[PDB]
């Protein structure tokens, strides 16, 4: 019989843990085997008139689909003057802003990319 | 950080001369005064590569100082049944029966049905607390009597629930039974579900009058002052067919109630059939009918989903207007909002000599500057210009208070970059109760937001707002075209899409050429009929936009500020649940326009092809550019030049969303194909409407469908139609200080379309 | 090259004992004799890594020699009105009116309506030749009189067409007028369409009796011998409301006919309302009603699309059973086929002692070997085994004569490789008229094939067939499971899905465990009800397959060999045109099962997740494999082993189509998750059902939805359900000479499910 | 006025010609700048347990979506014995088979790949 809904959990989350483990290991292997994509992203983070390499694209495809609880974005103190990196929190909560300010949004985007690579290295 | 401290909205978007608009402003706390004045919006994009922010102050009878005050907002759906005579607080025995479908059964304390005061614990309620269904009476001494169910509720499972108060034995009883069938619930008839209970408790106190109204999907906060009951403990999920009896019930009576049989029709104190009123025009009313015959009529507040699947729905009929006895439910999300119901602060009657243009009321509080944009129409029946600009207000409401980047996990993947957000986005995320949600969002349940409203402060409608995809999205992206028309010598009127819905093609026929905003993604059926009637008989139009007739919209008939959309598999953020595709406001299907044999190509030549949000492209001239029938378009443009290589929105002209030529979807046979856009990245994709099987490589530069297309065709009686098929066309007009290919092409077509000669044939 | 020279089919797929099956065989030319005998199919895959081809010859009363002969096939849709008394060849003046919608107006000579002999040019016809509408009468001397329209027809544009013969002036007239509205046609009301004409010609000859039947969408070939008219010049596209008057008409009468008004009700010789008969169960009949009142009733031949959008369809109703006066059309593709109508060559009455298994009739012609597979049932009301194997005949018909690799441009992209094709594929491509099309194909118009039939030679149903995606697909992929059951000691019965449709859960309850074929993609609604009733009360089942309940199917009530499916945006090859989603056979929606709140998870635990066809993967054990509740599944399997790394279908177990666990779609709450498949390539994709916005990286190894999932859950009364969620599970059983993880796991579960003890509560 | 349907053509085909020209030039530049993907496809044309490089994947994505009129496939004279390369023709027409026979289908697949690269080189 099935009578108490607290006896049961979403057992797909076990596979989500397994999948994220293997997927993080693959991503740091990609960053170690092609170290020039970091400077490629530093030179042009939008890919404007020079589209990304497929390995930089594969790293982007890992980073850009994660859940929003704990995802980074770019706050604007003053537009076209100052940019900070903020972490998404719960509802009713202000974001946790960073410390370093930036001048343009390309610099902030490359710093978010570097901080994401530091966070995926820190968990392993 | 920079904190927003003043808010506000209009009663209505568009106002002709002589008639009155009202402005409802709120501050964080009741202190001080705010300043106000009237401005004419000219330009909104503050990119240093562009013209920068532009406005004009207007001397008016509006300005002054006004007392700043905090105005409370009721937030979430409920049905309110007003009962001043305490007819629904019985003196003796009573019983409450309803069907239940809970989507968040473990999210705090949630009231299902009540006549309950909560400041003093008096009345009765039937509620979900700590995951279980609890029936509680109270007298007002604080000491209450509750009965608590045994089996906790499963999520999205239909339950029949009877709560009985019996003073003859001084006993509260609670009967619970699950009514799952093959189609109505989350899981099916294969599980061995054991979630039925019959419990009983002792009643120490008697239920007293709560001096509130009877509520469905909520608990009343305090005693009803000024004839208004505040609702606090909001329930999430469907409630079907509630009823109060004036007698006590047994287990056999609850067993017959569980099978949908109305036992004892003489003992019903009230009986609300939520499907009573479904005709062949849907159910476009908030009136909830008491089917018992006592005049205890209710009212839907904050627009719950009328016309939803009930407990007895099997999948044999999926239109609610044809099987209304299976569509008797009502969804009640906790974060619905159709009106803030605030009190007016000031008003404005439009003078005789005010030009029809974009306008805003600049609120100047302490260190916070807020605007409230509205639109001035030309006087009724007149037209003071040859050019009409349709402001895209239905798509302003669809994107109103949009929170994709905080709520959607695929928000950063659709854009090609990490998004940049303002303080308006963190104030939407922190004070959600004051603002509401967008149709591109979901509720806390999971289902998308269907109804969106104008009577709320819409934080991304202000012209200094920048959006998460990139530069700017709805209203400042239209102020690009407004600034371009003002920089040249063109004289234009401004209408909205609510006005076009009200007036038909009679509004459109007053003008030689009708222009279109940056992104008119949402249209009603009548707007499409008006555009087709306008172009069919000698009318001229420009489609300076993309995705231009995608979703079908109906404006609510009783409430012209509320707009409904229900979505499906397409370029979507959500899909409607299986039996619920048909609109409440008119009982029609209305999904996307392409699925109803009214594709956007069939009127405007091109239609939705691809989307993607990292940067933009440029147009390359096709061999029809050198045709001598369209030398008037390509006049001062060299035949080896790129078109729009550089701009303010994304960095080019063909970008952010693209439309293509397609005869099979209804493109007219004499359409010329002038140019097409190249250099689109891998983030630009084929829309799901054009796929049979997804195979690899449905991307930009790897599939032929990913492109934009600049087209022209002419209609009868000297009409014509010109499309540029790109969102970022208008963001490339003021590039290089208005000296570029985009402004020369658009100026060529606009100078030809305002002449008295007919538009040139193809 | 190797040329196929002998064909053949059955009247029916499944036959119990005592009852008779008939076999209809054809050769290329009438000479010689063919041999025939009965075999029991055991194994079909001839991969040298496997067991190789296996069969068993059975002594029967069937074998012998039979005369080989060529049997002609009528191919394409038409409505036939039998008229032996020449009532529809009038002696004086007559007029023919109909509405027209042409999809290939430039594809040769096409007859729309006729009573025309074409061997001798006698009778009258109304036809499209050289792109124009031509009205021709004839006497039989070869010399005819024609009138030819001025304006050629536009493609998929509704036209009203009146053809008048007037002997009082000796004058043929032809009136033509386009009736486009906002919704009915290809383009809309914005084009300046000038395609109306009134022409006239001289009539030299008189129309004589053609001794044929009146036809719609075709021309009669020769004189009707044996009471049968052969149709040759097939029309493609809709025809709405045809009528013959016994008088001549003027231009005012044609002008009133163009607006849908029946002028002169006394002068109608016949008037066929194609929507007459639409009730609330659709229109499940071939009877075409003469609404004039003369008993000239017609008959639909080769199944044209009943219940289609007519000329007066505006989009206010999209179900044909609720607005039947706008759904009066009939589509008539030129390559429809529901029955070859051949003559019987022999028959077979099933003996008393023949085991219920897979059977075929091996035709031995000159150098060509052809089979005709059929199925033997256990006797009526009995069961001779504990195991039932449901043969997946509805999905055999859906893939019958599948030609994706020759017709679809994305055929090679969905597979991950260049396809390899047999001589059966080149014989389908070269002789299409003898075979028909699949539901994964399109017609020559573009619209997908809805109806598929058993009474035709199905060339990919034979066990020596290999398929374009890779190894083997429908019937040999089930002979994998048949060979595995015969290699072990298991004793099984065989039923089909037509039998399960006929018998309900009464068929299923006779057995302890019911197994499922390799790929049951198509199910009826009643089959899903039967499976849910079986599992709900103590039944046990294995789902050794993927994509297992995707599309809703209805078998035609009058014709149990014809099957209908109508598709939409999903894992599809085509989508139905806008107002035409509802089935003719029952007036219900029936798209995919997930859109009707009957997802495959809701019965079988897992459902469609991903597809892709280059190679397969292997399962890795999840932490629930080490749970002690399911140690009976994982008995002789080490907890560090891969599962199914190597196989005959693709090279692994988890592959070619995958199903996943999802509680939100209806997976039971007590389901355990044993293993999951990894190492899927970029060609494996997320199905469109699970996408909101397509962003990059919806691929294998880049998205969490691309996986398979081996699950188990138990139901009440000692039932249970085990799924492996992969097509290539059964192709991995006989690997390493039956010594692998796949056969040990499947043998563990099958040994537990046949015991008298209840299945373990998990 | 719009009266004669032979006065009008699908003008999207002009862009299809432009698109196919630029797309063929891109593909032969990819084959010239990474010449090891040909031996990668020769070693393992299914990608079985060694998935393709993204440049080999981009070449596959060009080749596998072309129209069927003129597309190559693999005929079987005898299964697991002999394989030939055939060209798709109209309805009612036998395919035009090649000359070289092959032993397994991997050899036939790599030969179809080489013949496709020769055909895209011959048009330029
Ligand atoms: Fe949108
Ligand atoms: Fe399929």
Residue numbers in the entry:
A (entry chain D), D (entry chain B): 8 to 131
B (entry chain C), C (entry chain A): 1 to 762
Which passages does the manuscript contain on this structure?
Certain bacterial species from genera such as Paracoccus, Pseudomonas, and Alcaligenes have evolved to use DMF as a sole carbon and nitrogen source for growth via degradation by a dimethylformamidase (DMFase). We show that DMFase from Paracoccus sp. strain DMF is a halophilic and thermostable enzyme comprising a multimeric complex of the α2β2 or (α2β2)2 type. The active site consists of a mononuclear iron coordinated by two Tyr side‐chain phenolates and one carboxylate from Glu. The Fe3+ ion in the active site catalyzes the hydrolytic cleavage of the amide bond in DMF.
When the purified native or recombinant parDMFase was imaged on ice by electron cryo‐microscopy (cryoEM), the micrographs unambiguously revealed two populations: a smaller molecule measuring approximately 100 Å diameter and a larger structure of approximately 150 Å in diameter could be identified. Subsequent 2D classification showed that the smaller unit was a dimer, and the larger structure was a dimer of dimers. The dimer of the parDMFase is made of two α and two β subunits with a total mass of 200 kDa. In the presence of low salt, the enzyme is predominantly in the dimeric form, and this equilibrium shifted to the tetramer at higher salt concentrations (≥200 mm). Subsequently, we collected two data sets with no salt and 200 mm NaCl yielding reconstructions with an overall resolution of 3 Å (dimer) and 2.8 Å (tetramer), respectively. The high quality of the maps allowed de novo tracing of polypeptide chains of both the large and small subunits. We used the dimer map for the initial tracing, and the final model is shown in Figure 2 B. The model from the dimer was used to obtain the tetramer model. The initial EM map clearly showed a large density around residues Y440, Y399, and E521 that could not be accounted for by amino acids. The mononuclear Fe atom is tetra‐coordinated with the protein. It is coordinated to two phenolates of tyrosine residues (Y399 and Y440 serve as monodentate ligands), and a glutamic acid carboxylate side chain (E521 serves as a bidentate ligand).
